[PDB]
Design a protein around this ligand. Structure first.
Ligand SMILES: Nc1ncnc2c1ncn2[C@@H]1O[C@H](CSCC[C@H](N)C(=O)O)[C@@H](O)[C@H]1O
Ligand SMILES: [Zn+2]
Ligand SMILES: [Zn+2]
Ligand SMILES: [Zn+2]
Lengths: 5, 429
């Protein structure tokens, strides 16, 4: 899923 | 729709979000309440199931004993979703193991039955309109979706009236393409959710917005000035990596190749894969071999964390950094990846000194590789500050916590509860 880490 | 913004046809990028008014750095473009959301299993007891408030003394659901709430209101409000799992968890017991994607998808199906009409989360893009990339799916991806469909029928047949298998493959593909992970201030995974209006935004490796969370509410803030007519872009991935790595991830998970300024120019690729300035400079093929080795160890470690001991995991980090250091500089992203993984192992073992030792080496190169306002940078400064504070290094702790705050004021908003908690950490010590 669309994330930073 | 949403004031000051609009949905449009972005050439070569399907549908997108366009500004109709200027936005300055730190301005809130819009907020999006979660359409469907699920708190991750490992965070139960730490956060309220309904509103995601992180608090002590959360009330336990009396039946399953595996859902925690702020009070009876959060419990009651969560019941329409919680009922999908409550009795199943006690009945299946140890056998209850649906994947987070399956858990989220069951909640989407439940929401569609209760509220078939357009929700306040779908002012510009509806869940039904989500891009699926069904046509792009190979046999391996269809088999993974089929495993998910079987788990959905296995654990959630009590309350759900399922569409045909074809509609379920489209749904699981839409969820993989449009789903969001919700992360805390340290970028720790809290859960998964559907934010339809947020999913309208296309990707860029030089984004002009950052998505943050206030409980289950997604907030979208400018990290660059946005002018009327300009498309609003967020980053779908970790921006530490060079162009090829970024595009390999974008192609695999999102079925597209980025053509943003960063991907076109490849300006940052050289510093990201920094090579040691040796008397006998390393050969092109020797660099390529190390980049290949680096990507392989990243995957090896990813698998190893599921079964290896903390000392075995630290060994992989130390040994791989040693091999890489003969060709790569310490500021090189592959070196930084292993140091970050090693810091993570130290944090788990509660080896605060060891975690601090690693964080100190990571911070300066992180600031240089990531964009001006970056959640990855803010999060590293925050970890460092908390380590310094915990180890009685108050001046260094205060400096690092204030570096975290400065970035977070732009991304999360000046008034964000996370910033009030960090300021309380500075004030209490
Ligand atoms: N920078 C980019 N270049 C090309 N396609 C992009 C892109 N960013 C996002 N996309 C597309 O958008 C999908 C994610 S959902 C974003 C909204 C989408 N454009 C839509 O019409 O529904 C991707 O899997 C890809 O097909
Ligand atoms: Zn609550
Ligand atoms: Zn329960
Ligand atoms: Zn790009």
């Amino acid at each position: 899923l669309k994330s930073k880490k | 729709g949403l004031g000051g913004l609009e949905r449009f046809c972005s050439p070569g990028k399907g549908r997108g979000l366009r500004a109709l008014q200027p936005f300055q750095v730190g301005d809130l473009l819009f907020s999006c309440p979660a359409y469907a959301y699920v708190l991750t299993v490992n965070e139960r007891g730490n956060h309220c199931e309904y509103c995601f408030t992180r608090k002590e003394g959360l009330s336990k659901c009396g039946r399953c004993k595996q859902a925690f709430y702020c009070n009876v209101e959060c419990q009651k409000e969560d019941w329409p979703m919680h009922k999908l799992e409550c009795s199943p968890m006690v009945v299946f017991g140890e056998n209850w193991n649906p994947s987070e994607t399956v858990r989220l998808t069951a909640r989407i199906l439940a929401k569609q039955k209760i509220h078939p009409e357009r929700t306040p989360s779908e002012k510009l893009l509806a869940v039904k309109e989500f891009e699926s990339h069904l046509d792009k799916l190979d046999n391996e991806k269809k088999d993974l979706i089929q495993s998910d469909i079987a788990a959905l029928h296995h654990f959630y047949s009590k309350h759900l009236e399922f569409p045909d298998n074809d509609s379920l493959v489209v749904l699981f593909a839409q969820v993989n393409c449009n789903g969001f992970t919700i992360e805390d201030e340290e970028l720790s995974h809290l859960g998964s959710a559907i934010f339809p209006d947020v999913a309208l935004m296309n990707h860029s490796c030089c984004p002009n917005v950052i998505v943050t969370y206030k409980g289950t509410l997604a907030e979208v803030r400018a990290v660059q000035e946005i002018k009327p007519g300009e498309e609003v872009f967020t980053s779908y991935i970790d921006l530490l990596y060079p162009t090829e790595d970024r595009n390999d991830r974008l192609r695999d998970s999102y079925f597209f190749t980025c053509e943003c300024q960063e991907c076109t120019t490849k300006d940052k690729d050289k510093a990201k894969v920094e090579i040691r300035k040796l008397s006998d400079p390393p050969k092109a093929e020797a660099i390529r071999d190390m980049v290949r080795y680096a990507r392989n160890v990243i995957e090896e470690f990813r698998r190893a964390k599921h079964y290896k001991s903390p000392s075995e995991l630290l060994e992989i980090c130390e040994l791989s950094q040693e091999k890489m250091s003969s060709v790569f500089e310490d500021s090189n992203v592959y070196m930084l990846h292993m140091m970050y993984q090693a810091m993570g192992v130290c944090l788990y073992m509660q080896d605060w000194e060891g975690a601090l030792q690693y964080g100190q080496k990571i911070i300066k190169p992180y600031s240089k590789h990531y964009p001006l306002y970056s959640l990855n940078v803010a999060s590293m400064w925050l970890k460092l500050g908390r380590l310094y504070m915990g180890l009685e290094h108050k001046a260094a702790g205060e400096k690092a916590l204030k570096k975290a705050i400065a970035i977070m004021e732009v991304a999360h908003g000046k008034d964000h509860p996370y910033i009030s908690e960090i300021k309380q950490e500075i004030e209490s010590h």
